[PDB]
Amino acid sequence: AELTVDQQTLLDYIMDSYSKQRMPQEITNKILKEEFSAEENFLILTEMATSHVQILVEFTKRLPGFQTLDHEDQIALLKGSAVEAMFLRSAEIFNKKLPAGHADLLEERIRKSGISDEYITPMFSFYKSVGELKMTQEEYALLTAIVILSPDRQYIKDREAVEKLQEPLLDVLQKLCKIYQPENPQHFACLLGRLTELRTFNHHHAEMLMSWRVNDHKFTPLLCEIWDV
Amino acid sequence: ENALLRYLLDKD
Ligand SMILES: CC[C@H]1[C@@H](O)[C@@H]2[C@H](CC[C@]3(C)[C@@H]([C@H](C)CCC(=O)O)CC[C@@H]23)[C@@]2(C)CC[C@@H](O)C[C@@H]12
Known about the structure:
Helix content of chain B: 55-70%
Helix content of chain A: 55-70%
CATH architecture of chain A: Orthogonal Bundle
Keywords: bile acid, coactivator, nuclear receptor, DNA binding protein
Bound molecules: 6-ethyl-chenodeoxycholic acid
Chain A: Bile acid receptor
Entry title: structural basis for bile acid binding and activation of the nuclear receptor FXR
PDB class: dna binding protein
Assembly: dimeric
Order of helices and strands of chain A: HHHHHHHHHH
Number of domains of chain A: 1
Oligomer: heterodimer
């Protein structure tokens, strides 16, 4: 079991930072109490997502080196990863360890919330696939951090600067792959695979949106801005 | 423009 001190430090730091903010209890239990309605579900789901985004900007604001980047690039990294990051969380939430609590009920709200079962089917297929990988909090944390820290996002001016910040996360996740699952591996390769996949999911997501209707309810200001519309 | 995002990045 390798893992240098520099690497363990990054991991401990990232892990710390990863579990700080957390979703507000109000919005959370809002899926237990309160009930159905495609429009009510649509509002809850959209309320959380707006939350998630907020938590996400804080997490990446304290990712090693982030504030050191050009200000425009930071925006681009955020706008560029908000959706994909959301996918990773969705994955984390859905598969692995069922605390016999609200999460299985969240799936229900998602089903019939004005979302085409022609979209939820493949999407949930994906989450179940990433599930097969039997990932840990740490793997989810690093993936989220490397997803956010992608030098190949459409508008960044200085990609090397972002690279310097992402490689360390990449080196760690990989070494972490040998450790937890050496039986194969390929696992690290496959993990990076899912990272390319959800990039195409971002595309479908953008399309499913303009057809997402529910009565006439609108998304929150932030979402309209980050999800584009 | 991303005015909201910007605002969340500078003082939250
Ligand atoms: C077909 C799949 C659904 C789930 O992935 C939903 C997202 C909205 C955001 C969530 C509700 C995430 C939530 C904000 C995580 C909160 C947390 O941090 O605990 C996890 C489940 C997510 C839908 C409706 C809307 C966006 C679409 O691309 C995917 C939908």
